[PDB]
């Protein structure tokens, strides 16, 4: 519930004996706030989403003019807070619109005005079902059913760079499998297998611009890039840890937390407050598989969430190294 | 040498309906309720071309044409439809002016799939006789048959169109001046709504599908029996 | 209604002349409008005809099915906020009978 709207009118330059007539929905259609947003409820320009700012809050709205002859025209309009996002509400209002166009030239609504009465209950179950949870399937014609999703609308993604790492945060086993794409679903097996060079000739046999775009998507929704994991250091080694050595650094790392070029301090010098905050390597043999390739759980997760839920580790963490 | 009909033969039937234009106008208007073929091989040219022979044979179905429908089928392996269209519509010309109706007629009766004519979807509409009231078959056809020339003398003229399959399995009547189709197999009997007019071969006889669906509307409200229209034709049968 | 035997008549007889935009093309009660003349880039106002260009032939009174496929995927949200059938039908069929009216076809 980030977003949270409160009020929802429609307005109608009325027959010269009425300026312009209001259905609200409830902040309130007061006076001084009507007198001087109304020269924006009158355009030239038709058919284009505008909102204005005012010291209370923020109309959303959109006008439409019809029947030329003594020439009709409305508009609805969605007034919401002063400053919260509402990005996330110009195309349901638009969308709106533009079902009031169909309704009005198929079976013309706002020519009778017991339907003008019944326009007002579609938008009291409108203001309690975008607030509750933010979608509406709304029938009021044997012709139409409006239908209305909130999108959250998400920035933008960073780029795909060939030689970094995705990570999971979220958990694959969430999901359904059988829904997917063929190639998220072709390269998703061999996602934990760290470089994507390998990963792409290993699996997936694909245009490398193709998973560059696979990864990017997966990257605007819900999976991590970081970088290469090839073992720069090896002196961290002589401290006591009971088994905690390879994802300790894929976390942190995926907290972005570091300057890149780890060395050899990064690792002992958080360390050891991985040590109070609580065979072989073989570790001379993973460096050629690196090209191109044709307790009782390890406690690397629970105790940086579990200290995650106080605040002063990442803190001291944020500030990096 | 005759036509075997493995060689894809393009075939199209034309059809002439006698018609009254009595009843015609006011049902449209605000007014609210010896062999059995003959082969014939034509030329197809009235120009001077001295380029191309132009034969195609003429199959009537009618040898008698009492007052009942009459069909001309075109069987063509042959020469430019477009001269064939002219010559069909010259000869609709000469058939309004100074006489009657000829119509193209789709040739495929009330035909499921996987026959030789026919659609995968066509639905051989039904309607229902509620009747509400020695040989039943025999004399029930009879009686309908009165029903059907019945809507004859209001409103739509009927023929029984005897077509050309050999034992002549079901019975068929061809609506005059409309795009109907009727066959008498529950009880009442089927429907089916021509599909080859489409608004050329026109006149103002015919036409405005509008026309069709109120004699679909008329139909089902005098065959389910309302007012009382089927119990007082009842009396009115039975005062003879 | 023309059969390609009449279509590879008129070819024969197109073999060595001239042509332009919006030319009415006739031959035996056959009849065809040109249209959409091009040399290898450009489309040219007139020209030649002579035997090694080739011509198609388009109609505008075309017999066509339109098969729509249901799912359970046309009561589903897409991005930018639709339901799947809401696009095909509106849209996409709002502006197939839009351009069937502007380029004056009959199917």
């Excluded at chain 1, 179950?125 to 998400?154: F, M, W, Y």
């Excluded at chain 2, 020695?134 to 056809?141: A, L």
Aim: aromatic share 12%.
């Amino acid at each position: 519930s980030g977003c949270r709207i409160e009020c929802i009118f429609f307005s109608e330059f009325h027959p010269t004996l009425g300026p312009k007539i209001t259905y609200q929905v409830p902040l309130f259609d007061t006076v001084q706030v009507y007198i001087i947003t109304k020269p924006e409820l009158q355009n030239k320009l038709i058919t284009v989403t505008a909102m204005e700012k005012k010291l209370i809050g923020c109309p959303v709205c959109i006008e439409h003019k019809k029947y030329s002859r003594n020439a009709l025209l409305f508009n609805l309009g969605f007034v919401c807070d002063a400053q919260a996002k509402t990005c996330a509400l110009e195309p349901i209002v638009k969308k709106l619109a533009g079902y009031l166009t169909t309704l009005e030239l198929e079976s013309s609504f706002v020519s009778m005005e017991e339907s003008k009465q019944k326009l007002v209950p579609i938008m009291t179950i409108l203001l309690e079902e975008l607030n509750a949870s933010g979608r509406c399937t709304l029938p009021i014609d044997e012709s139409n059913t409006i239908h209305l999703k909130v999108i959250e609308q998400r920035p933008d993604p960073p780029v795909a760079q060939e030689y970094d790492v995705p990570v999971f945060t979220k958990d694959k086993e969430d999901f359904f499998n059988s829904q997917w794409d063929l190639t998220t679903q072709q390269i998703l097996p061999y996602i934990d297998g760290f470089r994507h060079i390998q990963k792409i000739s290993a699996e997936a046999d694909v245009e490398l611009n193709l998973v560059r775009i696979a990864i990017q998507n997966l990257l605007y929704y819900g999976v991590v890039t970081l970088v290469s994991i090839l073992q720069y250091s090896n002196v961290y080694c002589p401290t006591p840890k009971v088994q905690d050595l390879v994802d300790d650094k894929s976390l942190q790392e995926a907290c972005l937390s570091y300057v890149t070029k780890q060395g050899h301090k990064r690792a002992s010098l958080r360390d050891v407050f991985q040590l109070y905050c609580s065979q072989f390597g073989l570790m001379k043999n993973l460096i050629r598989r690196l090209q191109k390739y044709p307790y009782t759980g390890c406690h690397s997760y629970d105790e940086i969430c579990c200290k995650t839920g106080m605040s002063y580790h990442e803190l001291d963490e944020r500030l990096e190294n | 040498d005759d036509f075997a009909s493995f060689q894809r033969k393009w075939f199209e039937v034309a059809f002439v309906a006698e018609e009254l234009v009595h009843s015609e106008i006011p049902a449209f208007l605000l007014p609210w309720l010896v062999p059995e073929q003959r082969t014939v091989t034509l030329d197809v040219d009235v120009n001077n071309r001295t380029d191309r022979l132009e034969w195609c044979s003429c199959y009537y179905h009618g040898n008698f044409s009492l007052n009942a429908a009459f069909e001309i089928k075109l069987h063509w392996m042959a020469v430019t439809a477009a001269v064939l269209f002219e010559m069909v519509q010259g000869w609709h010309r000469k058939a309004t002016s100074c006489g009657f109706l000829l119509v193209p007629v789709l040739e495929g009766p009330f035909a499921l799939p996987s026959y030789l004519y026919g659609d995968p979807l066509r639905a051989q509409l039904f309607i229902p006789l509620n009747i509400s009231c020695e040989t039943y078959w025999d004399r029930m056809h009879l009686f309908q048959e009165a029903i059907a020339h019945r809507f004859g003398f209001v409103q739509d003229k009927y023929s029984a169109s005897a077509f050309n399959f050999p034992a002549e399995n079901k019975p068929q009547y061809i609506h005059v001046t409309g795009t109907v189709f009727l066959q008498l197999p529950r009880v009442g009997y089927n429907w089916a709504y021509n599909t080859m007019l489409t608004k050329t071969w026109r006149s103002s006889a015919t036409g405005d599908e509008k026309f069709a669906d109120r004699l679909l509307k008329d139909f089902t409200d005098f065959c389910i029996n309302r007012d009382n229209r089927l119990v007082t034709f009842w009396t009115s049968c039975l005062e003879k | 209604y023309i059969g390609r035997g009449d279509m590879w008549r008129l070819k024969k007889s197109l073999v060595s002349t001239c042509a332009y935009i919006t030319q009415k093309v006739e031959f035996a009660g056959i009849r065809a409008q040109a249209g959409e003349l091009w040399v290898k880039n450009e489309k040219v106002m007139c020209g030649y005809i002579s035997e090694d260009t080739r011509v198609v032939f388009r109609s505008t009174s075309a017999m066509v099915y339109i098969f729509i496929q249901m799912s359970c995927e046309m009561w589903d949200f897409d991005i930018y906020g639709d339901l799947y059938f809401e696009k095909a039908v509106n849209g996409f069929l709002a502006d197939l009978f839009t351009k069937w009216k502007e380029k004056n076809c009959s199917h």
